[PDB]
Paper text:
pmcAntibiotic resistance mediated by β-lactamase-producing bacteria has become one of the major threats to global health. This phenomenon has substantially reduced the efficacy of β-lactam drugs, which are the most commonly prescribed antibiotics worldwide. One such residue, at position 105 (standard Ambler numbering), is suggested to play an important role in substrate discrimination of class A enzymes. Interestingly, [name], the β-lactamase from [name], possesses Ile at this position, sparking the question about the evolutionary preference for this amino acid. Mutation of Ile105 to Arg in the β-lactamase [name] simultaneously enhances activity for carbenicillin and the ability to evade clavulanic acid inhibition.
In this complex, residues 105, 130, and 166 are slightly shifted in the [name] enzyme compared to the resting state form. Interestingly, considerably shorter soaking of the wild-type crystal (10 min) was previously found to yield the propionaldehyde ester adduct bound to Ser70 (+70 Da). Although the structural investigation did not indicate any significant repositioning of the active site residues besides 105, we speculate that the larger active site in [name] [name] causes faster dissociation of the Michaelis complex, thus slowing the initial ring opening of the clavulanate and formation of the acylated species. This is in line with the crystallographic observation that the short soaking of [name] protein crystals with clavulanate (∼10 min) did not yield detectable density for the adduct. The data for wild-type and [name] [name] could be simulated with values for k2 and k3 that are very similar between wild type and mutant. However, we needed a Ki for [name] that is approximately five times higher than for wild-type, implying that the reduced sensitivity of this variant likely originates from diminished affinity for clavulanic acid, rather than enhanced hydrolysis.
Numbering used by the authors: 28 to 57, 59 to 83, 86 to 145, 145A, 145B, 145C, 145D, 146 to 238, ...
């Protein structure tokens, strides 16, 4: 069955794989280690942007945030281009989603909850969406590096899927703010080889990736069939047996997505 097929992916990639797709009117839920904890890595940046959108008027997107070169302690290809002069909230949202910029996400955390309270406030946003499981405890780059088995900085496939479902398909956000989030996800530069690679080209896909130590590679997505029927897909993985420097395997996620697409076709 589907569980056997997912188990074979795990054997071949020497990995742990988590998959969740919510039920619809006509399709059963797809669940594989869906309630096991996996590190968010950069997947948290999608609800983070949602939180910042939700709590502020649209004009807040043009609020200028200044920061220094020494605020960059993580891979930040956009934020480095604009040090000292700063970046608007909107620019930070774009960078955090489309490039997975680390400093951009930290600055958004500070905008949401202040310098000390950002990770709690982010977690609290998830709580407001009924997610009582996920937790963000550290910011970039530490959130990508927690040991296997540690609950800190983790979500579950099930939990993050339900969050993304409310954000993109539900009414957690007003239409205008929702459209900004979905648009940034649609124009991301990091996700072509993950869930997108498992769905035929006539399906629409928007996603947010994450990558971390211990071979961590995640992708969360909303997809629409050629006739507009939506599904939410969360795929999470690690290769912790290889140690902190284990290589991530994007193709594992593409394969998991292909399995899902096959069932939903
Ligand atoms: C989001 O996932 C942002 C950064 N992740 C850290 C990274 O890619 C390094 C993995 O070794
Ligand atoms: Zn079997
Ligand atoms: Zn569950
Ligand atoms: Zn603000």
């Amino acid at each position: 069955d589907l569980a056997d097929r997912f188990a074979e992916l795990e054997r071949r990639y020497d990995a742990r794989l988590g998959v969740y797709v919510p039920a619809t009117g006509t399709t059963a839920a797809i669940e594989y280690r869906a309630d096991e904890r996996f590190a968010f890595c950069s997947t948290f940046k999608a609800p983070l942007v949602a939180a910042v959108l939700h709590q502020n008027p649209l004009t807040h997107l043009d609020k200028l945030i200044t920061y220094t070169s020494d605020d960059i302690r993580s891979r930040s290809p956009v934020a480095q281009q604009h040090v000292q002069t700063g970046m608007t909230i909107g620019q930070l949202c774009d960078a955090a989603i489309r490039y997975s910029d680390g400093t951009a996400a930290n600055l958004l955390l500070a905008d949401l909850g202040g310098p000390g309270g950002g990770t709690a406030a982010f977690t609290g946003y998830l709580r407001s969406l009924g997610d009582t499981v996920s937790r963000l405890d550290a910011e970039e780059p530490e959130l990508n590096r927690d040991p296997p088995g540690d609950e800190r900085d983790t979500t579950t496939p099930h939990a993050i899927a339900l969050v993304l479902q409310q954000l993109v398909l539900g009414n957690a956000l007003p239409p205008d703010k929702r459209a900004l989030l979905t648009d940034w996800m649609a124009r991301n530069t990091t996700g072509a080889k993950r869930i997108r690679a498992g769905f035929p080209a006539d399906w629409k896909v928007i996603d947010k990736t994450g990558t971390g130590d211990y071979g961590r590679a995640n992708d969360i997505a909303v997809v629409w069939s050629p006739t507009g029927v939506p599904y939410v897909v969360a795929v999470m993985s690690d290769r912790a047996g290889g140690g902190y420097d284990a290589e991530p395997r994007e193709a594992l996620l593409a394969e998991a997505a292909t399995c899902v697409a096959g069932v939903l076709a």
